């Protein structure tokens, strides 16, 4: 592979970095803005609306060699629990590869679709792993590299930086405090998170907000990630209040890298029973789920166990378990707050790629820019003996569907918390396969009502073996949909096996793109559209893009937010 | 990017001048795993009969060309594991574009042979619509003054050198006359005369006596001369085309010819729909005894219709065992009762030492003694073990049994036994039909992990008691987080084990999750030479002369890395850029000292 790569810098490389001189820079730009105004659920009675959750995840295993816009690899870190996350930190950086590292565009897009701000990484490594004081001194030069950090974030389109100083005086310490204050003064409406490590004298992790580290939070940073070795956080909460700062800008670190759900934690020291606070929660390396597994299925099973709990139901969490799950303390958030809302249950990778329920490529692929907004609840069912999981065997658009299967001798599955204003012309649409001939009803919940309305669709269409129902919602114009769900009824078979490959609320074709065959060993550039597809006549899908370009008789189409394709621009 | 040895394939004129000693790939294509004799059959299914045989026509490799000789760094590969319901395997391959004479690849011959299943190569004369040429048929049918057929000799030479058990002959090329037909019959008779004992020649029901392609779907007067002609044996068996409703008249005609009706294999085409294939089972298995044997066309549907190893394996279970998921309890009223409904499972666990590590033939990772020695995807079906006779038979609990590719002791897989088991509740899983003589110094060993601290007991059945004996081990060892038990069987010397099982008890947790990575009842450092592999100048081969397989490790900054495995006499390595370590593992998986190669 010789295509564009996600960026990473040593301080002296960054200082002379310019987008216009960097052939990979345009491929590393995100074109999916941060979704504002997420809406929270209320399924878990224990969950509080005070604490936030930061995730420090190695969304790419390595700093270097990361393709800008996806790769032909099924097993990739397709993290799907954005709904329990308030802030994502791209975990990366090393002495051998580069210490300043922005998130890759594919991951920025996925984060942004879910309304989660994502931060780049500034990592001053420990000296035992090749860390150098020089790099720290270079970054702290005063009269430029803070300006450069802010430039990278603006150009690539991410939301700030995580600063992690781990390289082993007071002059340097004070210069760091000035660097951080400078950032605060110069940043846009952006987050700067600092790791609890270097103290006032210049490395002594406090595991709390204390006198030694308080000057790193006039004000100097948006938050602090607290080191792991604590038993109680009340002191940090009290001191934060004394400083006139929210205790919830403090993120009490938990190291889950090695053991994940088997990590021992003193939860009561962070979440006192029948009590508020003490602080927010910082997760170090939840990508445990991915790095400790060999297969997509096991990876996804572990993420469920980690974020939801052993119950497998976000509404019925067990707070006395060794791992109650993140759903036990944190409301799920949803970016399904705008019409049109459209999902195809795309997990961000596949063993195959489908268009209208037909395989258009048999190759493995990942492109997290194509990951949809996935269900708020994993999983809430009523009735029957059924399991809900993602399937990479069947897909309507992309590489995955939602599978709902098992025994059914009435059953419902509640999928989405939403905030969708209904107007005339708005319709509900959904597309599924059924192996035992059972129909699949849609469910929708209206604001001011606590029960879902389950109905059969009005108009049925058959698309390559898939059934697509349409349900006009003109009768509820002026109302707001607050939930989405499905329902089914058992037949003589006694079995149910559904694959659902799309779900949408709204209505609607984009113009053929002006595509220019250009040099990188090629680069297509084109300038309402969800993503672009590049077919090859043999038709075979050879590329997808959510940006303004792709590196590869060709046919290029723009798909709208509703997934209506444009006429294909032919190119030779 | 692969520039190493490839599995062979030929057009008739390429075969004609083929010589093993000149072919750089030939030594890589030799199977070094002999056909296991004397399989033992189970009796779990009351309906199953012992008369009918089953032939499988499987595309064990999706393509004819580009098939690496000894495996590849690819997890998703056709790792067929229902050898136990198969009597004969036909390697499905050949095309007008790639080659029409195609032997099975060595990895697939090994796996077949480990399970006591004869495996046949393919000779495919394609329909003219798909590039078929009468010339190819005419070339194969060339005859010396001798009366000999030089290309028949070549078929026998290939089978002998590569070590497989015969040929499937499929004549689908239109435009042949009665003279061609008689020459084909003479070619087939010549094979019967010259073949080694035990070699099998199967003929497709296609070209009739006139030369015309008119599939009969039965044994009839139009095709009988391709099986038997008076007292002349023409072929060992016939694969009957798909369009039949009843086979009684085939059975009757076979008897009139003095041949077993079970040398006739009634074709069922399952390529597109697998378990959803409509079949008139009654027309084959009536009321008494089966009319004929069964021919399954493309059961590799399970692989080719799936995207992932897990769904592939689930489909094979549904296909071969049926919707019950229990070979002992099939549903004969189902549209698909499964193969276990009619066929006894056979086992080759008939010899001490019997050793398995539940290696499915591929993995996402490779382990040695419970530690990952390579994180790369791999397949090498030469390493596929003899897997459980029964998929699956359990008693008690709420457990599921499946293969896991997340955990492994040796190779890329383990047997996962997991779910709910309430405190004090007992559960058993019966795995193997066996025939293992116990003598002094014989022991049972098994290696597992338990995620909720339940112990795993072994089960063994003695001839011919009906109950399994469930006992805890006696000597425990901890190996990289895995527990290995040893149970001496000196107390039962002179007895024969006829089955193997496992058992567990539920604890306070109410949950059980086992991964079992070895089960067993029961070398010198390899002399290694670095040799040129002529077609690839930047490549090498290691050649050496008791041993299950060889493992090739290379030194890294991160510890030893597994870079190759071989069940033959050699291995090809691309781009060797280096210190290598080659060990021989015994049948008991005792490793030799490593031979160091620079
Ligand atoms: Ca595929
Ligand atoms: Ca792996």
Residue numbers in the entry:
A (entry chain D): 3 to 145, 151 to 175, 178 to 198, 200 to 212, 214 to 228, 233 to 424, 428 to 526, 529 to 540, ...
B (entry chain A): 2 to 288, 290 to 524, 530 to 552, 556 to 586, 588, 595 to 615
Which text from the study accompanies this structure?
Endo-β-N-acetylgucosaminidases (EC 3.2.1.96) (ENGases) are a class of enzymes that hydrolyze the glycosidic bond - GlcNAc β-1,4GlcNAc - present in N-linked sugar chains in glycoproteins and release the N-glycan moiety. Domain 1, with residues 2–350 being identified, is the largest and displays a typical (β/α)8 TIM barrel fold, which has been observed for proteins belonging to family GH18 and GH20 of the glycoside hydrolases. Endo-A catalyses hydrolysis and transglycosylation via a substrate-assisted mechanism, in which the C2 acetamido group mounts a nucleophilic attack at the anomeric carbon resulting in the formation of an oxazoline ion intermediate.
In summary, we have determined the crystal structure of Endo-A, the first representative structure for members of the GH85 family of hydrolases. The secondary structural elements of these two domains are interdigitated. In the structure of ligand-free Endo-A, H2O846 is interacting with Y205 and could fulfill the role of a potential nucleophile. In the structures of the free Endo-A and Endo-A bound to Man3GlcNAc-thiazoline, the side chain of W244 is perpendicular to W216 and introduces a steric block at the entrance of the active site.
